[PDB]
Amino acid sequence: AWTQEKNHHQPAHLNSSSLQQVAEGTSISEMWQNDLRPLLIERYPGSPGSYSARQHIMQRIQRLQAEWVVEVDTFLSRTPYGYRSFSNIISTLNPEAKRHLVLACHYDSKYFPRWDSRVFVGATDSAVPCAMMLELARALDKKLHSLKDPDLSLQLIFFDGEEAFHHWSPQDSLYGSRHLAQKMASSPHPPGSRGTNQLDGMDLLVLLDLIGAANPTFPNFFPKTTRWFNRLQAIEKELYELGLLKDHSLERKYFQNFGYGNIIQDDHIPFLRKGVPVLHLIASPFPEVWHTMDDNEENLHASTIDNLNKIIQVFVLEYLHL
Numbered sequence: 001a002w003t004q005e006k007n008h009h010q011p012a013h014l015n016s017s018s019l020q021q022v023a024e025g026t027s028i029s030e031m032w033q034n035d036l037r038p039l040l041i042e043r044y045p046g047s048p049g050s051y052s053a054r055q056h057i058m059q060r061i062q063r064l065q066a067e068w069v070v071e072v073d074t075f076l077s078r079t080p081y082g083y084r085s086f087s088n089i090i091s092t093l094n095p096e097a098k099r100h101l102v103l104a105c106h107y108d109s110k111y112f113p114r115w116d117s118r119v120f121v122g123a124t125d126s127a128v129p130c131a132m133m134l135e136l137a138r139a140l141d142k143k144l145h146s147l148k149d150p151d152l153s154l155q156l157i158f159f160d161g162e163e164a165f166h167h168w169s170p171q172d173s174l175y176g177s178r179h180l181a182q183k184m185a186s187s188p189h190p191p192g193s194r195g196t197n198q199l200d201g202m203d204l205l206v207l208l209d210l211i212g213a214a215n216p217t218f219p220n221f222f223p224k225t226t227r228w229f230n231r232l233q234a235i236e237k238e239l240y241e242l243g244l245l246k247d248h249s250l251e252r253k254y255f256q257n258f259g260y261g262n263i264i265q266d267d268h269i270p271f272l273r274k275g276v277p278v279l280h281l282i283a284s285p286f287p288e289v290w291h292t293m294d295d296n297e298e299n300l301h302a303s304t305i306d307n308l309n310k311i312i313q314v315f316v317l318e319y320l321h322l
C-alpha cells in the first residue's frame with residue numbers, strides 16, 4: 001500500500017560536491033532582504049500585517065520557477081476574542097503526487113496588546129522559519145522545478161493562528177493547524193481514492209519553529225522520525241566537516257539527541273494526532289527572547305540561520321532524491 005511508503009522511504013545522500021552546491025546555492029542575505037524582512041511586521045491573525053505577510057509569502061513562492069500551486073485555507077474560528085479569520089497558506093509541488101514531504105512554519109505572530117509603539121514580530125517565531133522555507137524554495141528552485149517530470153514531492157505550509165490569542169491552551173492555539181489537519185483528513189487523496197486522504201499523503205511533516213537565535217538545540221521528539229533526525233545530525237556533521245557551515249563547530253551540535261524530547265505543543269500536534277510523522281524542529285530551550293519584543297531582527301543570528309538553511313535544504317534534496 002502506498003501510504004506505507006513513507007515508512008520505508010530512504011534519503012538519497014548527496015556527495016561532497018552536491019553538498020558544496022547546496023551550501024553555495026543559498027544566500028542568507030538574500031533571504032534576509034527578500035524573504036525575512038517583509039515578514040518582520042506585526043502579523044497576528046486579522047492584522048494588516050497578516051495579509052501583507054500572506055501576500056509576501058505567496059508572491060515569493062509564485063515568482064519561482066517550480067510549479068508551486070498556492071492555496072489559502074481561510075476560515076473563521078472562535079478565539080477568546082470572538083470569531084476571527086485565519087488563512088493557512090499551502091504551497092504544493094505536484095499536487096497530484098500521492099506523497100509530499102511537508103515543511104511548515106506558522107506565519108502569524110502572537111498577538112499582544114498594543115501598549116506602546118513596539119510590536120511583537122516573532123522574528124524567530126516564526127518569521128525566520130517561514131523565510132527559511134521561502135529561501136529553501138528559492139535556493140532549490142531549479143531542482144524542485146525538475147520534479148514536474150516515488151510519487152513524492154514537496155509541500156510548504158505556512159500556518160496561520162498557531163499562537164494563542166490570550167493564554168495558550170488547546171482551545172486557544174493552533175487554530176490554523178487544527179483547521180488544516182481536519183481539512184486534510186476530509187480531503188481524499190489522491191482524488192477519488194476511497195480511504196486515503198491528504199494526511200496519508202504527508203510523508204513527513206517537518207515543522208520549523210523558534211529558529212534564528214544563536215546556539216539553538218533541536219531535540220529529537222519522536223521515535224517514528226528519529227532516522228530523519230539522524231539525517232539532520234549527519235548533514236550538520238558532514239557540512240561542518242566540509243567547511244560549509246559558518247561560525248559553528250560540533251561542540252554544541254544543533255541536532256543533539258538527548259533522548260526523546262518531551263513533546264512541545266505546536267502546529268504539528270493536530271497532524272501527529274492523526275499519525276502523520278513529524279519532525280519538530282523547534283529550538284529547545286526557547287530563545288531568551290521568546291514572546292518578548294526583542295524577538296526581533298537584531299537578535300537574530302544570521303550564521304545560525306544560514307547553517308540551518310544549508311542543513312535543511314540538504315535534508316530536503318536528499319529526501320526528494322534531488
Ligand SMILES: *[C@@H]1O[C@H](CO)[C@@H](O[C@@H]2O[C@H](CO)[C@@H](O[C@@H]3O[C@H](CO)[C@@H](O)[C@H](O)[C@H]3NC(C)=O)[C@H](O)[C@H]2NC(C)=O)[C@H](O)[C@H]1NC(C)=O
Binds near residue numbers: 015016017018
Ligand atoms: C556527486 O554526485 C553528483 C550528482 O549526482 C555527480 O554528478 C553526476 O554525474 C552523473 C554521471 O556521472 C550525471 O549524469 C548525467 O545527468 C545529466 C543531467 O543532470 C544528463 O544530461 C546526462 O545525460 C547524464 N549522463 C549520462 C552518461 O547519461 C549527473 O547529472 C551528475 N549530476 C550533477 C548534479 O552534475 C558527481 O560526479 C558526484 N561527485 C563525486 C565526487 O562523486
Ligand SMILES: COc1ccc(NC(=S)NCCCn2ccnc2)cc1OC
Binds near residue numbers: 209210261264
Ligand atoms: C518540552 O516541553 C515544553 C512544554 C511546553 C513549553 N511551553 C509551551 S508554551 N509550549 C508551547 C509553545 C508553543 N509555541 C511555539 C512557538 N510559539 C509558541 C516549553 C517546553 O519546553 C521548552
Ligand SMILES: [Zn+2]
Binds near residue numbers: 110
Ligand atoms: Zn510563539
